[PDB]
């Protein structure tokens, strides 16, 4: 960060093509390292901004893994990058939304932002802003108008994700925005069998208040009843059965909650569900677990 040594280099016009094996841009170190006085002297060789390494990475995306964001702000008048992806895909939008700046989902309002670009998962920048749930995300994003709960591959609806984590604060806010409590992903889980396979009481207790079904089967029988008994999670089996949930629902395995509780040697779970459950459906492993979005 030498900046009158950078000026002396640019009289002998030294290539911004300078790209090393990583795949790093003269960009990049700028971004990473805060040595930004040199940026207007890049510019004075008319730098632009559009570059991408073997890793399809832009300095903007370098930029908000160590944000120093008053170089941003004004890269973006200069030809910035509104929509660029990474090569998995991934918009600066999400992102920036799990590095979570205070003011980043600011600085891309300068301009505006898309959250809902296709990921090659097919996850959505909401969906990612959703999973961590932040307390300024839920006030923030409601300016960017996108689709409240948006499906992925799997068809994870973020109340999915938000029920994964057991964050109350997000599926409040989503339930609030007008989401599907009862999203089902492309095996037909909902938020409710998730939570249940979480176990988390508080993130099945928000969707029990959100109205998603406490009977909601799976394409393969599982409800999220038979989801708190493989999981174990006696908690969420109690919120689940004193709310209504049926304890009688035969899978496509002919295994029901009882069953399941009983081959885990879960007996804590296995007390209630047992005698809840009424007789096996048929005399007698395969189990059932919702889907996630991939590495």
Same mark, same amino acid.
């Given at each position: ?24 841009? !003269? ?97 959505? !920048? ?170």
């Amino acid at each position: 960060g030498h900046v009158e040594t950078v000026l002396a280099l640019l009289e002998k016009e030294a290539s911004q093509a300078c790209m090393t094996k990583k795949g790093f841009t !003269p960009l990049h170190v700028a971004a990473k390292y805060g040595k930004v006085r040199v940026a207007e002297l890049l510019l004075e060789r008319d730098a632009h901004p559009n570059a991408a390494g073997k890793n399809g990475l832009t300095p903007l995306h370098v930029a908000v893994h160590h944000n120093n964001l008053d170089i941003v702000k004004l890269l973006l008048p200069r030809g910035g990058s509104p929509h660029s992806p990474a090569w998995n895909g991934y918009t600066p939008l999400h992102i920036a939304a799990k590095q979570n700046q205070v003011e980043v989902a600011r600085s891309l309002l300068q301009y505006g932002g898309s959250a809902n670009a296709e990921s090659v998962q097919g996850v959505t !920048p909401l969906h990612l802003a959703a999973q961590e749930g932040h307390a300024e995300m839920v006030a923030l994003l409601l300016s960017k108008q996108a689709n409240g709960n948006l499906g992925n591959k799997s068809g994870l609806t973020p109340l999915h994700l938000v029920a994964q984590e057991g964050h109350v604060p997000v599926a409040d806010v989503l339930i609030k925005h007008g989401v599907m409590v009862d999203a089902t992903t492309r095996m037909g889980y909902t938020p409710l069998h998730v939570a249940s396979h979480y176990g988390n009481i508080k993130l099945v207790k928000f969707l029990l208040q959100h109205q998603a079904d406490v009977n909601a089967k799976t394409k393969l029988g599982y409800s999220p009843l038979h989801q708190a008994a493989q999981q174990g999670h006696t908690d969420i089996v109690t919120l689940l059965l004193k709310n209504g949930a049926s304890p009688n629902e035969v899978s496509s395995d002919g295994t029901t909650p009882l069953a399941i509780a009983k081959r885990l040697g879960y007996i804590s779970v296995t007390d209630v569900l047992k005698v809840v459950t009424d007789e096996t459906s048929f005399v007698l492993h395969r189990m059932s677990f919702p889907e996630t979005v991939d590495e």
